[PDB]
Symmetry: C2
Subunit: 340 residues, 2 copies
């Protein structure tokens, strides 16, 4: 027996309720005698992990009592986290955005990973609406993968970083494109322009991924849908200039990463014949965000065309295994106005 | 009447919450109320008043106590769900721009800077600042911070001020050597901003008395370098953005959950316009070496004062009108990290 899936169910507490989820995402089991929350399990993984694995095995064989798992009831696996740090591993994407400003990208960007520190304390659940005051802010989804690490020492090596990867999940790094230029122009990175993100209903162990996980990257299309229509099928194993251990090593240069740290891959992006990717409806692999499409329209046609997310739109993100079954469950979110 | 809270280091990640006497000599575990500061903040509307009764008992002698050792204290939140650090003393920003020779857009006087910081691995007040290389421009940064209860997205100044729960000092450890290179990448600070440290004790606004005016702390911030007065800059002067303003800015497009830490940015004072002078010369000095080097470069050509090297010792504390330490002392020796 190999692999397991974990989820956090919304409840009256801030950290929610940890459950072990069946491979098919239909059944789950509370595990309060081992750990009440995912963070607690991570805090003591060396001991809690093996015990959760036995529960996972028991769910598979039916020896373990279960209830129904409802993605609509899931929080993000860590509803609040101690760290959210997001890379830009598909350096093609940042090349496109840099090139749209009609500027050249330093060679250094192929060798030196980007990362930003994100808000970690108020993540949206996979099915919660993206609520915002104003959709003139260039609301955009950003489909990525993330790993959750155990403790990582300051100055960690690649072997250390690899070995510290405990869970994988999908992410929607919600962005406000209209606010980005002026904010970064302040010089202090992202804050207002990067609101609360959302993660998939389930996080899985590397073992669960099977051959789709090479120890440092995922080798599967990331399905991003917009209003029911395929928007991106970009392969997470293609054009990824920096893998997860590389991002982790980068992150740990001058600081430890405590257990529960979430590292984002950055928006998944694919080139086509060495050129900008083309849309799915044209045979291309599409895009994991609307920003990348607009950049390409800007380069191609001198300016953006396709509009960002407006109230009422729906975005879906999920990853399917070789046989077509969902691995992490689905992020599916309706954009709507925040009621104050 | 006010109170002081601390977290003692123990075998767990979140440490042991204690209530601390006003004189910082005694303290008491409060496990029947909350094991951790976070847990108290999570349920503050109920836990807060219970903790206040304990503080009151410590004061009268009714509550059994033990000795408080600042050396055994973690940061009050050893790990936090959020750390966001402003630069509310825009004077400092203007000086960094000046040493480069760019005018500052007048918008920096009405638009707060803020950045997302590492929150998961804070050093304790007396823990050493360990770095692999002291040629990275290791610098201290004295500031004040506030811990907030839940703040809704798009919160107002009134809600902002009402959400302030605790006040503490901070050393925002900075690697100046890496800052230029990192920021040029365009994604803000990460590698150049290592783990920070907070004061041994966090205190309620009420404890601060008049020195707190609801948005601002009005006392000198003591920064020492190897036992010498380096900064005595007043935290209520030249503070162009108050804490509520910092909070409202942070909350524009996101809620802030209970336990969110908001830093004011390095405390800096103008003399009468233009740069402050080094304490030894009658002025209020500085709360970071960087500010000093900017002043040296601007008037003179190039930095003359080195940053922190191994063996250097920094102290950061704040004393009330009567000269008693309010928060306890951050005191750290810079040292070589090795694996
Ligand atoms: Ca991103
Ligand atoms: Ca700072």
């Amino acid at each position: 027996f190999q692999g397991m899936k974990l989820a956090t169910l919304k409840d009256s507490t801030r950290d929610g309720k940890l459950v072990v989820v069946s491979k098919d995402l239909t059944r789950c089991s509370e595990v309060g005698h081992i750990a009440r929350t995912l963070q607690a399990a991570l805090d003591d993984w060396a001991h809690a992990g093996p015990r959760l694995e036995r529960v996972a095995e028991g769910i598979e064989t039916g020896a373990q009592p279960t209830m129904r798992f409802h993605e609509h009831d899931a929080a993000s696996p860590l509803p609040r986290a101690f760290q959210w740090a997001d890379g830009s591993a598909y350096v093609n994407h940042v090349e496109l955005v840099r090139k749209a400003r009609n500027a050249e990208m330093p060679a250094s960007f192929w060798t030196d990973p980007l990362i930003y520190q994100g808000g970690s304390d108020s993540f949206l659940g996979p099915r919660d609406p993206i609520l915002m005051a104003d959709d003139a802010w260039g609301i955009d989804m950003e489909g990525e993968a993330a790993v959750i690490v155990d403790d990582v020492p300051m100055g960690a090596t690649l072997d250390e970083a690899k070995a510290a990867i405990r869970l994988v999940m999908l992410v929607n790094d919600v962005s406000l494109r209209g606010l980005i230029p002026g904010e970064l122009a302040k010089g202090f990175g992202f804050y207002q322009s990067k609101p609360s993100s959302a993660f998939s209903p389930v996080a899985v162990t590397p073992e669960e991924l099977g051959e789709a996980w090479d120890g440092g990257k995922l080798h599967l299309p990331l399905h991003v849908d917009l209003n029911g229509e395929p928007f991106g099928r970009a392969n997470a194993g293609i054009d990824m200039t920096f893998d997860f251990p590389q991002l982790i090593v980068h992150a740990a240069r001058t600081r430890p990463l405590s257990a529960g740290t979430i590292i984002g891959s950055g928006t998944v992006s694919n080139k086509l014949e060495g050129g900008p990717g083309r849309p799915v409806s044209e045979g291309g692999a599409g895009y994991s965000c609307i920003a990348e499409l607009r950049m390409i329209e800007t380069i191609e046609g001198g300016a953006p065309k396709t509009q960002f997310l407006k109230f009422g739109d729906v975005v879906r993100i999920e990853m399917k295994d070789r046989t077509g079954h969902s691995i992490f469950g689905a992020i599916e979110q309706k954009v709507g106005k925040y009621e104050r």
